[PDB]
Ligand binder design. Structure first.
Ligand SMILES: CCOP(=O)(COc1ccc(C[C@H](NC(=O)O[C@H]2CO[C@H]3OCC[C@H]32)[C@H](O)CN(CC(C)C)S(=O)(=O)c2ccc(OC)cc2)cc1)OCC
Lengths: 100, 100
C-alpha cells in the first residue's frame, strides 16, 4: 500500500502470537516495543537514545514479526517506549520507501 | 525522489539562510532542530516527549523551510535534540508518502 502522513502511520503487527499497532518510523534505526511485551528467550542488555535522553532495553535477536501480513525477522528491542516503533531494520525487509 | 531505508533518510534543508541535514521522520508529529539553530522572532514555551522522557523546546510558527528545494511553511521546534528532525507537519507539505 501507499500511505500518506496526515495521520500517524500505525500498522497492525503480530509478534509471537500477540497483536499490536506499531508506528512505521523512518527516523528510527531499531524496532522498539512497549514494556508489557513478553518475548521468550535470552537477551542482551542495551540502552537506546532519543529525544529526552536514554532508556534501558532488552535486545531480542531473530524475532519473527508479521507487519501488514509480510513476514520479517530481525532484532526487536523491548522497554518503556511510549509507542511501538518499527525501525529501518524491519522497514527495509518490507521494501518500505519514502516518496515525494 | 524515491528513497530506500538502508541508510538514515537525511536531506539537505535550508532554513532562514542556514543549511543543515535533517531526518525525514515519519514517527515524528513535529519538526525539531538542534539547539544551536538561531531563529528570529517570538516563541512560546513547549515541551516534547519521546524515548527517554521529555525535553523543553521553543516553538516558532510560520517558518519557511526549504526541503530538497520544495518550499514549505510550518511550525518548527528548536531544542537540545540529538538530530534535526522533519516531522509529518512538514512531510505532508512535500507530498511525502510511505510505500511498501
Ligand atoms: C513521554 C511520552 O511522550 P509521547 O508524546 C512520544 O511517543 C513517541 C516517542 C518516540 C517516537 C519516535 C521518535 N519520534 C519523536 O521523538 O518525535 C518527537 C517529535 O514529534 C513528537 O511526535 C511524538 C514524539 C515527538 C523518532 O521517530 C525516533 N527516534 C527519535 C529521534 C532520534 C529520531 S527514537 O524514537 O528516539 C529512536 C528509535 C530507535 C532507535 O534505535 C536505536 C534510536 C532512537 C514516537 C512517539 O507519547 C505519545 C503517546
Amino acid at each position: 500500500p501507499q500511505i500518506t502522513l496526515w495521520q500517524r502511520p500505525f500498522v497492525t503487527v503480530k509478534i509471537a502470537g500477540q497483536l499490536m499497532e506499531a508506528l512505521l518510523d523512518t527516523g528510527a534505526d531499531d524496532t522498539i516495543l512497549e514494556e508489557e511485551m513478553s518475548l521468550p528467550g535470552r537477551w542482551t542488555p542495551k540502552v537506546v537514545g532519543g529525544i529526552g535522553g536514554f532508556m534501558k532495553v532488552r535486545q531480542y535477536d531473530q524475532i519473527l514479526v508479521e507487519i501488514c501480513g509480510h513476514k520479517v525477522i530481525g532484532t526487536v528491542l523491548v522497554g518503556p517506549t511510549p509507542a511501538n516503533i518499527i525501525g529501518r531494520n524491519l522497514l527495509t525487509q518490507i521494501g518500505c520507501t519514502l516518496n515525494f
